[PDB]
Ligand binder design. Structure first.
Ligand SMILES: [Mg+2]
Ligand SMILES: [Mg+2]
Ligand SMILES: [Mg+2]
Ligand SMILES: [Mg+2]
Ligand SMILES: [Mg+2]
Ligand SMILES: [Mg+2]
Ligand SMILES: [Mg+2]
Ligand SMILES: [Mg+2]
Ligand SMILES: [Mg+2]
Ligand SMILES: [Mg+2]
Ligand SMILES: [Mg+2]
Ligand SMILES: [Mg+2]
Ligand SMILES: [Mg+2]
Ligand SMILES: [Mg+2]
Ligand SMILES: [Mg+2]
Ligand SMILES: [Mg+2]
Ligand SMILES: [Mg+2]
Ligand SMILES: [Mg+2]
Ligand SMILES: [Mg+2]
Ligand SMILES: [Mg+2]
Ligand SMILES: [Mg+2]
Ligand SMILES: [Mg+2]
Ligand SMILES: [Mg+2]
Ligand SMILES: [Mg+2]
Ligand SMILES: [Mg+2]
Ligand SMILES: [Mg+2]
Ligand SMILES: [Mg+2]
Ligand SMILES: [Mg+2]
Ligand SMILES: [Mg+2]
Ligand SMILES: [Mg+2]
Ligand SMILES: [Mg+2]
Ligand SMILES: [Mg+2]
Ligand SMILES: [Mg+2]
Ligand SMILES: [Mg+2]
Ligand SMILES: [Mg+2]
Ligand SMILES: [Mg+2]
Ligand SMILES: [Mg+2]
Ligand SMILES: [Mg+2]
Ligand SMILES: [Mg+2]
Ligand SMILES: [Mg+2]
Ligand SMILES: [Mg+2]
Ligand SMILES: [Mg+2]
Ligand SMILES: [Mg+2]
Ligand SMILES: [Mg+2]
Ligand SMILES: [Mg+2]
Ligand SMILES: [Mg+2]
Ligand SMILES: [Mg+2]
Ligand SMILES: [Mg+2]
Ligand SMILES: [Mg+2]
Ligand SMILES: [Mg+2]
Ligand SMILES: [Mg+2]
Lengths: 59, 71, 134, 95, 22
RNA sequence: GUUGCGUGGUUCACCGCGGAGGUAGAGCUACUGGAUGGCCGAUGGGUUACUGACGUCAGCCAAACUCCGAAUGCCGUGGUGUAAAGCGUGGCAGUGAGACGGCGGGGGAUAAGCUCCGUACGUCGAAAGGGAAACAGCCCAGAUCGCCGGC
RNA sequence: CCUUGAAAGAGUGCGUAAUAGCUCACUGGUCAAGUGAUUGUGCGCCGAUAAUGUAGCGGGGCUCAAGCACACCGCCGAAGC
RNA sequence: UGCCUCCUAAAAUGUAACGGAGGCGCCCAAAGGUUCCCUCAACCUGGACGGCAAUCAGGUGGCGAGUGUAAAUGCACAAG
RNA sequence: CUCGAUGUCGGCUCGUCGCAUCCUGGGGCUGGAGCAGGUCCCAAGGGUUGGGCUGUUCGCCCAUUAAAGCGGCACGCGAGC
RNA sequence: UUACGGCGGCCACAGCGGCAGGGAAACGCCCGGUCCCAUUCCGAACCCGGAAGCUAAGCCUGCCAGCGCCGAUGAUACUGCCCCUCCGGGUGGAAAAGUAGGACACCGCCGAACA
C-alpha cells in the first residue's frame, strides 16, 4: 500500500511545520516525486501539507 | 495607575509521567492549589517538591487535586 | 436609560462579531423588531424609537424594550494630543447583534402596529425587519 | 394523516448536515422508550407544511425506508436569521 | 479623500488576491 | 552569524501514549455585579391607586463574574522519517531606529499611510524573475553559467 | 345602531364657514379569462455631488459581448521544472 | 522612577502603553513552636431593660463568616 | 517629504478653473389677483462699483448698481513689486 | 455461607429527605460521680465503675424521583489548517445548555452468632 506524492506548489511563504513536513516526506522541489508506505504517520504528514502536494496511489 | 509587580513564573514545572530526581521542584504556586501526595513535600511557600526519584502522578483525593511520585 | 451603578467605569469596547444566541424570538408581545446588523445602540436612539412608537399608537397596546444600554463609551476632550490617559465616559450603549429582538409590541390593529414598528425602525442605525409570534 | 418519506442518514456531522440542508432536507434523530437513537433525513418543504397545517404536536406517521413507525416531534432548531428548520427531535410514541 | 479611496479600492483584483501594501 | 576542536541524532516533523489549563463559546436560582416585564407585597406617602424592598414566574448582560468549557498551543515519552539539526567549549563578529500585510487585542472617535503589544505568521530589509497599467512590504516563484529546446 | 332590504355612509377623498352639489365604500344585468396580495431570490435604476484636460475599463473599442453565472475544451505564460 | 496583587495577557511561562484598579517602606514576645479541643455568618421562633441589630435557649445552615494588613490563590480535613 | 534652507500675513500686478448661481436667460409649484415675492429645477456666455475706519483677512458704515456670488490653484502669484 | 460490629477503598449515580421492620453476640441509648480525668459554669462533654430498662433515637435492612446528583445521541456555538476579495466554503476537532435516560451506591480486610 504505497502512496506516490508529488510536490505541486512552492515552499516560499509556507509555515515552519509545513516546510518541515515536506522535508520529512523527502520532497525537494516542484514536480519531484517520492514513494511512501501508507500509514498513520504518512497520512498525518500528507494532511499537514495537503495543499502543496498531490497524492495518488501508484505502485 | 501605571504600577505593577514582577511576574513570578508560577505553575507546573514537571508534568505527569516525567522522571524526576529527589528534591526537584514540581509546582510553584500560591496556597495549595495542588496538594502534596505520597513522596511529595510542600515547602515553606507551597512548592510541592519531590522527596524521591520516580515519575509524577496527578490524582484526586476527595476534592483535592494531588501530585504524587511513584518509584 | 442609564444604569444606577457599574463596577467598572472604563471598559473595553464590546466585541462586534457573531450572531446573537439569546433573545432571538418574541417573548413578551406578539410583534417585534429583529436586528440584522451589529451596532452600538444608544439610550438616545432607544428613547427616540420608543417615543415614536408611543406617539404613533397614542393609546392602547404595550411596548417592551428588551435591551438596556449598560456598556459605557468614553471620549477624550476635543483639543488634546495623543495618549495622556483614557478619557471619561460619555455615552451609554447596548451591544446589538443580528437576530437580537430589540422591541416588543402588542396592539389590536396589525396595520397600525406595523406602521409604528416601521417608524421605530427608521430611527435606528441598523437594518431591521418586523417578525411576528408565528 | 401526516405521511412522511424519510431516509436513514448515511453520514452525520457538520459537513453532512450542511450538504443535506443545501439539498433541501432536514436532519433529525429518533429516540424514546427503545433507548436507541436513529439518524433520519426529513424532506424540508413537506415537513414544514405538515407542521404549519397540523401544529407542532401533530402525530407524524412517518415510515422508515423499509419499516413503518409513527412518532412525535420533541424539539426543533430554528435559525434566528433564516427562521427555517435546521434540526428536528422526533420521539417515538406508544400510542 | 478620493485619492485614498481609489488607491485602496484597486487591491480588489484577481492578481493581488485581495491584499496590497499600505 | 561564522569558524576550530569535542559529542553524534540528542534538533525538527508526523503518529500513538501520559499530563496542567480557563481563552473562544456558553451559563448564571453556581458566586459577585448590572438589568426588562408580571405576581406577591418590605418601608416610606395624606384610611395607602404614590417609592415598591425580598422572593418567585419568564427573558437578559459582564476585561478585572464562572457551576462549566473547547480548538490550538506547551511539557514528557515510544515508534517512523530526515545529511548540512541540536548541545559543549574557544577565536572573530555585526545587530540592539525596523516597515508593510494577515489574524487576536489595548489606546484613539473602535478615524488615521495613527500609536502600543502578541502571533515555529509572511514578505521587504538583505530577493532578482512573472502577474497586479505604473506600484519595497500584495499573488506566483527563490537567479551557478550557456542554448534561436519543451512543460 | 336599526330599517322599503334591487342595492346602501348621521360620509371615502378634494371641496361650502354653514345648507347644498361633487364622486366613492356596495349591488342588477351588458361583455368573457385570468386578476390581485405577499415571500426569497439573479442581474439591474435612483440617492451620486469640485475645481489645468477626457481623467472611477491602462487605451482603441465592446451588448452581432470583447459583460455576468454555471459546465466543458484547448493554448499562452517566469531566471519555477 | 523601587517592591507586592489583579486585568489587559489571546486556557504553559513571558509580554507594551503618560492602559484600567489597588497596596508596601510594616506589625506580632505572641498574631512564633508544639499538644489537645471546637465550628462560622445569616435566617426563623421564644425571652425585663433589649429595640433591625447587646447577652440566652431551640431549630435551619458546607461555607455565603473569619484570616494583623491590598488583591490573588488557598484554607470548614480547617491555614478560622 | 523637505534641518549641507520648501521665504512665512495682508496689499499690488497678472490670471485660470469649478458651480454648491449674485445679475442677466428658461421653467415647475405656490398660503402666485396684478406689481412684486418665496421655494425648487436647468443654465458658468458675459458681467459682478468707488470710498471711510483698521497692518490687516474678516467686519461695520457711506453713496451707487442689474449685480455688488462662493471656492481651488504651496490659505495661486516676493529669481514680479 | 446468612446477617450483624469495626477498619478501609471511593467522595453524591453514593447525598438530603420520606415510609416501614431489629436488638442473639454486638453497637448505642441508660445508672451514679468512690477512684484517673474535666468543665473559660455545669459528670452537658471527656474520664471512671456498671448493666435497672429499651429499640424510642443513633445504627442496620427494604421501598420511594420527592429535592439534589450523573447524563447521552443528534444538532448548533466555537475552532486548527486550507480556498476565498468579504460573503461564505472544504477538511479535521467539538462544546455549554437542553432532551432521552440513569440513579435511594459499589468494592476489600478482620471479628461474633450462625458455618
Ligand atoms: Mg502580577
Ligand atoms: Mg516565611
Ligand atoms: Mg446567553
Ligand atoms: Mg434604519
Ligand atoms: Mg486539553
Ligand atoms: Mg481569569
Ligand atoms: Mg464571551
Ligand atoms: Mg449572575
Ligand atoms: Mg470570562
Ligand atoms: Mg497562550
Ligand atoms: Mg561562537
Ligand atoms: Mg537602544
Ligand atoms: Mg529599539
Ligand atoms: Mg488589528
Ligand atoms: Mg490597534
Ligand atoms: Mg506606522
Ligand atoms: Mg503583525
Ligand atoms: Mg539597513
Ligand atoms: Mg521582487
Ligand atoms: Mg527570506
Ligand atoms: Mg516583481
Ligand atoms: Mg503549453
Ligand atoms: Mg464614479
Ligand atoms: Mg533553476
Ligand atoms: Mg495572563
Ligand atoms: Mg498565561
Ligand atoms: Mg502609592
Ligand atoms: Mg498561627
Ligand atoms: Mg501556643
Ligand atoms: Mg487557628
Ligand atoms: Mg526644515
Ligand atoms: Mg544643520
Ligand atoms: Mg541641494
Ligand atoms: Mg479666483
Ligand atoms: Mg446646477
Ligand atoms: Mg396677494
Ligand atoms: Mg420661481
Ligand atoms: Mg456664467
Ligand atoms: Mg456660444
Ligand atoms: Mg499663498
Ligand atoms: Mg523680495
Ligand atoms: Mg515665486
Ligand atoms: Mg505676500
Ligand atoms: Mg522660485
Ligand atoms: Mg441483643
Ligand atoms: Mg453524668
Ligand atoms: Mg436504637
Ligand atoms: Mg425504631
Ligand atoms: Mg455530543
Ligand atoms: Mg450539558
Ligand atoms: Mg439519592
Amino acid at each position: 500500500s504505497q502512496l506516490k506524492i508529488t510536490q505541486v506548489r512552492s515552499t516560499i511563504g509556507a509555515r515552519w511545520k509545513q516546510r518541515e513536513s515536506l522535508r520529512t516526506l523527502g520532497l525537494r522541489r516542484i514536480r519531484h516525486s517520492v514513494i511512501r508506505e501508507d500509514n498513520a504517520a504518512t497520512r498525518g504528514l500528507i494532511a499537514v501539507v495537503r495543499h502543496l502536494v498531490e497524492v495518488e496511489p501508484a505502485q | 495607575n501605571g504600577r505593577d509587580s514582577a511576574a513570578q513564573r508560577l505553575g507546573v514545572k514537571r508534568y505527569g509521567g516525567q522522571v524526576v530526581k529527589a528534591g526537584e521542584i514540581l509546582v510553584r504556586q500560591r496556597g495549595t492549589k495542588f496538594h502534596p501526595g505520597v513522596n511529595v513535600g510542600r515547602g515553606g511557600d507551597d512548592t510541592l517538591f519531590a522527596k524521591t526519584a520516580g515519575a509524577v502522578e496527578f490524582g484526586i483525593k476527595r476534592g483535592r487535586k494531588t501530585v504524587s511520585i511513584v518509584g | 436609560l442609564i444604569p444606577r451603578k457599574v463596577k467598572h467605569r472604563k471598559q473595553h469596547h464590546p466585541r462586534q462579531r457573531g450572531i446573537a444566541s439569546g433573545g432571538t424570538t418574541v417573548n413578551f408581545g406578539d410583534y417585534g423588531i429583529q436586528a440584522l446588523e451589529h451596532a452600538y445602540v444608544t439610550n438616545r436612539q432607544i428613547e427616540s424609537a420608543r417615543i415614536a412608537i408611543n406617539r404613533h399608537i397614542k393609546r392602547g397596546g404595550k411596548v417592551w424594550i428588551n435591551i438596556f444600554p449598560d456598556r459605557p463609551l468614553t471620549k477624550k476632550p476635543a483639543e488634546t494630543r495623543m495618549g495622556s490617559g483614557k478619557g471619561s465616559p460619555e455615552w451609554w450603549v447596548a451591544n446589538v447583534k443580528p437576530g437580537r429582538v430589540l422591541f416588543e409590541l402588542s396592539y389590536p390593529n396589525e396595520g397600525v402596529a406595523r406602521a409604528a414598528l416601521t417608524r421605530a425602525i427608521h430611527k435606528l442605525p441598523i437594518k431591521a425587519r418586523i417578525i411576528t409570534r408565528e | 394523516s401526516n405521511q412522511l418519506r424519510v431516509t436513514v442518514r448515511t453520514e452525520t456531522g457538520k459537513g453532512a448536515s450542511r450538504r443535506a440542508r443545501r439539498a433541501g432536507k432536514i436532519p433529525a434523530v429518533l429516540y424514546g422508550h427503545g433507548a436507541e437513537p436513529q439518524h433520519l433525513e426529513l424532506p424540508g418543504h413537506d415537513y414544514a407544511a405538515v407542521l404549519r397545517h397540523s401544529g407542532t404536536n401533530a402525530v407524524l406517521t412517518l415510515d422508515i425506508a423499509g419499516k413503518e413507525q409513527l412518532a412525535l416531534t420533541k424539539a426543533l432548531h430554528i435559525h434566528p436569521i433564516r427562521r427555517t428548520i435546521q434540526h428536528a427531535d422526533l420521539l417515538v410514541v406508544r400510542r | 479623500a478620493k485619492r485614498g479611496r481609489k488607491k485602496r479600492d484597486r487591491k480588489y483584483s484577481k492578481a493581488n488576491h485581495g491584499k496590497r501594501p499600505n
